[PDB]
Design a binder for this molecule. Structure first.
Ligand SMILES: Nc1ncnc2c1ncn2[C@@H]1O[C@H](COP(=O)(O)OP(=O)(O)O)[C@@H](O)[C@H]1O
Ligand SMILES: Nc1ncnc2c1ncn2[C@@H]1O[C@H](COP(=O)(O)OP(=O)(O)O)[C@@H](O)[C@H]1O
Ligand SMILES: Nc1ncnc2c1ncn2[C@@H]1O[C@H](COP(=O)(O)OP(=O)(O)O)[C@@H](O)[C@H]1O
Ligand SMILES: [Mg+2]
Ligand SMILES: [Mg+2]
Ligand SMILES: [Mg+2]
Lengths: 367, 367, 367
């Protein structure tokens, strides 16, 4: 038997057996109950559709993401994600695979207890471990030192690791992006008359967030050049047929990551949380936090980064210091490519939670 | 085969086989425990890093000097200093080499016994001799008479030696230099906002004690030119982005050597310990103590000495007596260049402690 | 006419004329600009609200404390604190009152000069003196000898005074508390799902630092009884209606005072800085510093000290030495009750800085 690396995405849950390429299965985590009367009565209709079927039945359901602010909203829907995934996606037996699960560095307890407990008693996995997503993005990177910027929809993190230790008093969590970037994009699409009201229509917003957004090099000059009559304007096509023309707002929405006041978030931007996390680390270690600034996750893949991120950090940081922004190929699968390396090496198999230990100590005192 | 001269520095431990030019190994003596949580778990991280690597891995460790106020603070770290030095620096086996160790003339007994005993019983050397650090600097100096200064971070001593034997009742111990100069520099750089709070950051202070400091010719008039618009400000560069500009305090810290009331030490300065040790020596011998004054150790290498020390001694000394304060080139290796000359010469090699005599007498009668 | 004692709070600026019972005005020192679009247009909204009214107008502003790590961060807002205090609280003319101002024992210069200079040239005070806060707590103490532990949010100090002299070679400053205690409390309330990321709610964290915290007598046994189902849990009420139930973390947070490791600070605890400052003083003068251990400042108000503080000092100190921990009622006003006694005394009113001296000597020779 082989171990299974399953990343508890907040998107965009990722699943695949131990190594070597990229996750076997990726899906948007949606469950949706039917919001219009069934009186056609074929019948044959499912009580709750999961993805991908919840993306081929839009407008007849009400899509509900089961993870909200990085917290499992109800484990009733979450367990159904898991069951659906193991049985009708991956097609593997629970009692036959040691698993690897992920979490967020700054998150409430007993959220990991209740998780660990429900998966051991419901699915009876033969072994389990729960890793923070940032440490796996360090393993994925393959650098041995650096400050990790792990940004997925929608919990970001700033974790500093230096060969091979970490500082407790340094992690910063912003709930800045990205589901709020979806809502903000929906609020500034009203500026060109596009009103997307329903849950289903929110997916269309997400599709323009995927394909057509970019980030500016300099805010003031992109705002200036938007005022020019020259066509920044991009023509999107709608699944119903319609042609949607977006301009200014196309670079405005991601720019929020360099200015949270515009989305109504008081705290300082990714720009400043990077600097302020570096200046919570000791004198010697700062030298190598500069030039081991490592980004990760799907929401760091916008076209205007990393050279925006580069120019902005390089301006605020102390003069004459070597600053390079490490941005891997295919950051969306970074965490998973991390997890594969971890569970395949010796000896951290003997840092896995196992059934004998669970029988003795249950959800209590896991470390 | 060849005998080994290993000088028990208080700094800055010095090691090299017998003959002729300079020590083969010099290192900051630091042992450092791991102070942060080891979340990477690669791992390969050793239980404790010694120097030199504990000076390239600062902030991930907490440096604890193993010799404190001139006494070995714990032999658990000290034995590891020795073992690390013999095996992974010099690259030799102790059963193959007679060793030569150093001590201080005004230190506790039986801490020289316990040293001698632990190295004979732990490392199994075939022969040993223990010299006080001042006497070896006389052989290095090549003089037949004079007062000897071993001044290191943090115990100095002042020993008068005549032709061909020493004067028992004239030895003076000042605890004034040099770790108290390190700590005083760390307290008076805070007055210009350079608040070096942590243990690790204290090493950076020590590095500014090497390069930037100097000594005055007259305190009152150097204090005058600090008040002047003229630059006494020298700008140092740090491993972090930070350019530090110190002025007055740059010459203020070493001046403590001629005024221990600055560091709140009640003892009289180098000025007075020179004079008062000479005026505890006999009238006839004083004639040849003047103009046979030998400085040694790393903390006598500051720029503004020795003609400050000279001018101060010439002011207190009797009228019409010729006084030249002659201190060698390359003082940092002085003690060691002593030890090489001693252990290579006939005949007192056959007055060394040897394995059978150690078996017979143990730590008893080591004087 | 009458002299005015105005204490330059780290919190918590305190003001009242010479004598008797307590300061007449106490306030949290915050300035806050409005972080929202002002499109209601009443109008009448001030450019920035100072305290205390800015603590009844939270959330519609972004509160910024003017003193950060024991230094005044920008003197424009500091000057506005002063201007607001004299004019819109006290209602006294600066040209009519000789004042008394405070500072921290170990702080960079020209921080007291630049302050003194700005207050003389901007507000045109007729006479002034600047006292360090620990010395003023000596008059409040009512003992003429002893070691002063002055801890306010966030500068602690350890000053030894012996009838009626001060030992300069022994003052210890820990930057251990208290804004970092607020921040640590905000970070360990996330463990029970209570997260308070934005500025206004951070005040509420400070309020829970008052009310529900207590110092443990035995850490290991309080952690044990926390593991038990016994009601260590206290129910707080939150301004929007929420009921917050905190347990463990209530006694964990203040315990940081004896374990700097909790906040990740390298430095030694109050436990050890008390002992290590005493063992930097002269032999005959700590036997009278034991039992004249005098606490001060608002961050020593917690229940659970002083008999924790007592047991901890008594455990590290040598046997057969009498120990007593002097902790006044109302330590929050200690500094001020000091200042009142000072400004009433003859003759050292004529050792205050007068305008004639300032006209002649300016910002030089202040100390
Ligand atoms: N090319 C792209 N440009 C911008 N955003 C993208 C792109 N591709 C995916 N995303 C966003 O990234 C999110 C997925 O991030 P992910 O790395 O899965 O986070 P997590 O792993 O925490 O769930 C999606 O919600 C999507 O909105
Ligand atoms: N150029 C320099 N100027 C001033 N001090 C120095 C210089 N070089 C070394 N030192 C000091 O001298 C010390 C080393 O002295 P050393 O002769 O090794 O004493 P010991 O042999 O007793 O250990 C170091 O702690 C360092 O602070
Ligand atoms: N009952 C209490 N328990 C614990 N902490 C308190 C209590 N009352 C006040 N404090 C803390 O003490 C601080 C005020 O201390 P203070 O003596 O004003 O310091 P300073 O005078 O240096 O400003 C506040 O920041 C508050 O957090
Ligand atoms: Mg994530
Ligand atoms: Mg020495
Ligand atoms: Mg204070």
């Amino acid at each position: 038997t082989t171990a299974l690396v399953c990343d508890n995405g907040s998107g965009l849950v990722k699943a695949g057996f131990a190594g070597d390429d990229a996750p076997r299965a990726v899906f948007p985590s949606i469950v949706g109950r039917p919001r219009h009367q069934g009186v056609m009565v074929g019948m044959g209709q499912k009580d709750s559709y999961v993805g991908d079927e919840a993306q081929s039945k839009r407008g007849i359901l009400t899509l509900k993401y089961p993870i909200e602010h990085g917290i499992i909203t109800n484990w009733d829907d979450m367990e159904k994600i898991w069951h659906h995934t193991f049985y009708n996606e991956l097609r593997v037996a629970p009692e036959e695979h040691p698993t690897l699960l992920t979490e967020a560095p700054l998150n409430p307890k007993a959220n990991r207890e209740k998780m660990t407990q429900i998966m051991f008693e419901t699915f009876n996995v033969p072994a389990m471990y729960v890793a923070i997503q940032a440490v796996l993005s360090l393993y994925a990177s393959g650098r041995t030192t650096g400050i990790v910027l792990d940004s997925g929809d929608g919990v970001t993190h700033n974790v500093p690791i230096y060969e091979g230790y970490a500082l407790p008093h340094a992690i910063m969590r912003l709930d800045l992006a990205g589901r709020d970037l979806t809502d903000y994009l929906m609020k500034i699409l009203t500026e060109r008359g596009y009103s997307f009201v329903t849950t289903a229509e929110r997916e269309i917003v997400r599709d323009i967030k995927e394909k057509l957004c970019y980030v500016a090099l300099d805010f003031e000059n992109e705002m200036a050049t938007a005022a020019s009559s020259s066509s920044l304007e991009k023509s999107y096509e709608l699944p119903d047929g319609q042609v949607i023309t977006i301009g200014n707002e196309r670079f405005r929405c991601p720019e929020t990551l360099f200015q949270p006041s515009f989305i109504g978030m008081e705290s300082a931007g990714i720009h400043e949380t990077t600097y302020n996390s570096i200046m919570k680390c000791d004198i010697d270690i700062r030298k190598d936090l500069y030039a081991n600034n490592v980004m990760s996750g799907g929401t760091t893949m916008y076209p205007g980064i990393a050279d925006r991120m580069q120019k902005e950090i390089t301006a605020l940081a102390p003069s004459t210091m070597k600053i390079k922004i490490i941005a891997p190929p295919e950051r969306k699968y970074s965490v998973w490519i991390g997890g594969s390396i971890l569970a395949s090496l010796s000896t951290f198999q003997q840092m896995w939670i196992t059934k004998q230990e669970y029988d003795e100590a249950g959800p209590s005192i896991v470390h």
